[PDB]
UniProtKB/Swiss-Prot annotation:
EC number from the UniProt entry: 1.14.14.25
Summary of the tissues where the protein is detected: Expressed in brain. The mRNA was broadly distributed with higher levels in gray matter zones and lower levels in regions rich in white matter. Not detected in fetal sample but its expression increases linearly with age.
Enzymatic class: oxidoreductase
Catalytic activity: cholesterol + reduced [NADPH--hemoprotein reductase] + O2 = (24S)-hydroxycholesterol + oxidized [NADPH--hemoprotein reductase] + H2O + H(+); cholestanol + reduced [NADPH--hemoprotein reductase] + O2 = (24S)-hydroxycholestanol + oxidized [NADPH--hemoprotein reductase] + H2O + H(+); 7-dehydrocholesterol + reduced [NADPH--hemoprotein reductase] + O2 = cholesta-5,7-dien-3beta,24S-diol + oxidized [NADPH--hemoprotein reductase] + H2O + H(+); 7-dehydrocholesterol + reduced [NADPH--hemoprotein reductase] + O2 = cholesta-5,7-dien-3beta,25-diol + oxidized [NADPH--hemoprotein reductase] + H2O + H(+)
Organism: Homo sapiens
Entry's family note: Belongs to the cytochrome P450 family.
Protein name: Cholesterol 24-hydroxylase
Binding positions (heme): C382
CDD domains: CYP46A1-like
Length: 434
């Protein structure tokens, strides 16, 4: 009854249903999500008001499935899932040092070496006939980049190593999904314990290295440790280990996979991207940091890919006091749902919204004003945004330099939702050298 007055109903995902309801019922609509009543707010005025203010905190009820799954602590109170402002702010300020401009410039060697490894593996299969899962190959690349860049760890998933780790990540993502019988419970719980035990093993290795006075370059793990200096126990440390182990590869992989999928049906845009990489980097194996800013059309293509295919569709804020939102009375203690997926597909905000058009992000084009937020906005925006944008530009630039991709017929463009949105199909392609 407390929500009955709010407007609403009486390879598809629930976000497509929400899109249909926002179009039909307007900027404030009641929905059921993760078995709670929520209100989806899709005006840009609401996005600005609620996301650009430290007055509005995340609604912790809507993060339970990242905190704990089936009674196993997962991300716990790490940086994504901590919804207390002061507890979040303390860790954010310490971990931010690992995402400074100087920190990220130092990661270009890791980005280049893993991108070069992927392209060499793909070139050996570029016979126009062997089907390759670009979803799988881009996930292995993203995991290898993250493990090296964040932790100084070589996972070598691109060599076929760490299969139990790859399986554990897959079942943990299925667990998040199922949360929000007997064998699936056992497999999910053991996978979460395995990921935390990877953290314990790697933190002990880092501590022993530091004790023996071995050289350890400052990385994300350095700052994760710094945030816990004088903690009562290692459970905060492991919460952020697992948070960054998962967060630092999965959305990047999703975004790469979506971009390759969509580009397979955009031959003219691919010819333009191939030309731009030819003009900017030439034959050079290695992209320098200053080359990234020169790949302007690729930047636009990746922004348009996130408009239609945001791996992280949005966020929630807790409305504490009854508030009028776009002419609608919204009760206190309500989860407000913000969706860049829904707003990206509304003709109100984007003309011909299903058309893939990188020129929407061109230099003279008007910037979306609070209608586009694939890294969210405000104080709780993605800490990894610049990390992600650099690594994906390096991977995509190296693929475009060296290879041609054709999507295998029968492969779909639809979505699935696990913890994030990702292609329904494996993005199975045949390849040829340029
Ligand atoms: C294309 C890639 C990526 C996308 C689309 C993405 C998207 C997002 C979004 C929408 C949020 C806000 C989530 C919320 O409000 O609940 C977020 C937060 C976060 N992301 Fe990402 N992300 C990406 C890459 C990364 C990477 C590479 C890392 C780490 C290296 C990372 C770590 C995080 C963390 C730790 C947070 C929580 C930040 C905070 O609240 O202070 N993300 N991301
Ligand atoms: O569960 C979430 N929000 C709850 C309201 C429902 C999102 C929180 C932000 N997440 C990320 C953000 N940056 C990078 C990666 C992830 C990521 C990917 C895989 C698994 C976990 C997290 C995406 C999920």
């Amino acid at each position: 009854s407390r929500y009955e007055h709010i407007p609403g109903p009486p390879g598809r995902v629930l976000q497509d249903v929400f899109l249909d309801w926002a179009k039909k019922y307007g900027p404030v609509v009641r929905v059921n999500v993760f078995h709670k009543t929520s209100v989806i707010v899709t005006s840009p005025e609401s996005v600005k008001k609620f996301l650009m203010s430290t007055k509005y905190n995340k609604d912790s009820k809507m993060y339970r499935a990242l905190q704990t799954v089936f009674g196993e602590r997962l991300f716990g109170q790490g940086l994504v899932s901590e919804c207390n402002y002061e507890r979040w702010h303390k860790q954010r300020r310490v971990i931010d040092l690992a995402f400074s401009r100087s920190s990220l410039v130092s990661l270009m060697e890791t980005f280049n070496e893993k991108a070069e490894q992927l392209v060499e593996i793909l070139e050996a299969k570029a016979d126009g006939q062997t089907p390759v899962s670009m979803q799988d190959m881009l996930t292995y690349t993203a995991m290898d980049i993250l493990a090296k860049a964040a932790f100084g760890m070589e996972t070598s998933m691109l060599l076929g190593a760490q299969k139990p780790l790859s399986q554990a990540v897959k079942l943990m993502l299925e667990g998040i999904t199922a949360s929000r019988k007997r064998k699936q419970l056992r497999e999910v719980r053991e996978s979460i314990r395995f990921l935390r035990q990877v953290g314990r093993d790697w933190v002990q290795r880092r501590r022993e290295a530091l004790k023996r006075g071995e050289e350890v370059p400052a990385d994300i793990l350095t700052q994760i440790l710094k945030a816990e200096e004088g903690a009562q126990d290692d459970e905060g440390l492991l919460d952020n280990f697992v948070t960054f182990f998962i967060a630092g590869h999965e959305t990047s992989a999703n975004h790469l996979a979506f971009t390759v999928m969509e580009l397979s049906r955009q031959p003219e845009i691919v010819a333009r991207l191939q030309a731009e990489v030819d003009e900017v980097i030439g034959s050079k194996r290695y992209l320098d940091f200053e080359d990234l800013g020169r790949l302007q059309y690729l930047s636009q293509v990746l922004k348009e890919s996130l408009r239609l295919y945001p791996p992280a569709w949005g966020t929630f804020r807790l409305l504490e006091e009854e508030t009028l939102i776009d002419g609608v009375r919204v009760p206190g203690n309500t989860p407000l749902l913000f969706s860049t997926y829904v707003m990206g597909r509304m003709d109100t905000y984007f003309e011909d919204p299903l058309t893939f058009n990188p020129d929407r992000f061109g230099p003279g084009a008007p910037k979306p004003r609070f209608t586009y937020f694939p890294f969210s906005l405000g104080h709780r925006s993605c800490i990894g945004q610049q990390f992600a944008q650099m690594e994906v530009k390096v991977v995509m630039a190296k693929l475009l330099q060296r290879l041609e991709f054709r999507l295998v017929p029968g492969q779909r463009f639809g979505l699935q939702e696990q913890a994030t949105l990702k292609p329904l199909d494996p993005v199975l392609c045949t390849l040829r050298p340029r």
